Design a protein around this ligand. Structure first.
Ligand SMILES: N=C(N)c1ccc(CNC(=O)[C@@H]2CCCN2C(=O)COC2CCCC2)cc1
Ligand SMILES: [Ca+2]
Length: 223
C-alpha cells in the first residue's frame, strides 16, 4: 500500500495473509471455512494466516490454517487477468472472534465515487522497494469506468473496476495482491493489477466481486 497508513492491529479482521513459507498475497475471510483471493495468487501449499498484524512477529491473535483446496475461477485468463478471483478452503474451520471475522459479500454492485477501504502488507514505495511488517490501509473512491478505461485502453473488462486517485500518490501495490477492497461494509473488490504503483493516471484495477456472488455462493455450497 502506497500513500496509506498503519491500520492498527486487527482493525481489519477479515484481512488474511497467504503464506507459502513467506507472505505472498492477501485474501478476505468470507466465512469460517472460506477465503476469497485473486486467481493470480494461485499456488499449492498455501497456509492461511488469520488474526495478523505484524506478519513477522507472533503477537498472539494469529490462527494459521492450511488450505484443503483452491478453486480458480473457471474463466480466469492469466494473460489479461479477466476473472481474477479464487476461493480457498481452510482444512479446519477458523475460530471467529473480534480479531478474526468474515466480511459480507455484496447484495449489489457499488457506485462510482463510493469510498472504500483497501488493505495489505505490500510495498509502500512508489519508486523502489519497502515492505511493511504491519498491515497498511488506504481510503480510496471507486473511479468512473470511463476514467478507468481511459487509463488502460482495451484492457478493462466488465469484471474489473478502478479505484484510487488519478493524481497518483495513493494506491495498492505488489504484495497487496488478492486482498480486500471493502465499500459500505461489503467486499466489492480484490487487489488485481495496475501499471506501476501510485503513478499519475494509472489507478489500481480490482476484481469486481459483485459479478461473482452467485459463483461464490454456489461453489462454496458444493465444496
Ligand atoms: N498499482 C496497483 N494498484 C497494483 C497492485 C497490485 C499489483 C500486483 N499485480 C500484478 O503484478 C499482476 C499479477 C501478475 C501480472 N500483473 C500485472 O500487473 C501485469 O500484467 C498484466 C496486467 C493486466 C493483464 C496482465 C500491481 C499493481
Ligand atoms: Ca503476527
Amino acid at each position: 500500500i502506497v500513500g496509506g497508513y498503519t491500520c492498527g492491529a486487527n482493525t481489519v479482521p477479515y484481512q488474511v495473509s497467504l503464506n507459502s513459507g513467506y507472505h505472498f498475497c492477501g485474501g478476505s475471510l468470507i466465512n469460517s471455512q472460506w477465503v476469497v483471493s485473486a486467481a493470480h495468487c494461485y499456488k499449492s501449499g498455501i497456509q492461511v494466516r488469520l488474526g495478523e498484524d505484524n506478519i513477522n512477529v507472533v503477537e498472539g491473535n494469529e490462527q494459521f490454517i492450511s488450505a484443503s483446496k483452491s478453486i480458480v475461477h473457471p474463466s480466469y485468463n492469466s494473460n489479461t487477468l479477466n476473472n481474477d478471483i479464487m476461493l480457498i478452503k481452510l482444512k479446519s474451520a477458523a475460530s471467529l472472534n473480534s480479531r478474526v471475522a468474515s466480511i459480507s459479500l455484496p447484495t449489489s454492485c457499488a457506485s462510482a465515487g463510493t469510498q472504500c477501504l483497501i488493505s495489505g502488507w505490500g510495498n509502500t514505495k512508489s519508486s523502489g522497494t519497502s515492505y511493511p511488517d504491519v498491515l497498511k490501509c488506504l481510503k480510496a473512491p471507486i473511479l468512473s469506468d470511463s476514467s478507468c478505461k481511459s487509463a488502460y485502453p482495451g484492457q478493462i473488462t466488465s469484471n474489473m473496476f478502478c479505484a484510487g486517485y488519478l493524481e497518483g500518490g495513493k494506491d495498492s501495490c505488489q504484495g497487496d495482491s488478492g486482498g480486500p477492497v471493502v465499500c459500505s461494509g461489503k467486499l466489492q473488490g480484490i487487489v488485481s493489477w495496475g501499471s506501476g504503483c501510485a503513478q499519475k493516471n494509472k489507478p489500481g484495477v480490482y476484481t469486481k466481486v459483485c459479478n461473482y456472488v452467485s459463483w461464490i455462493k454456489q461453489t462454496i455450497a458444493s465444496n
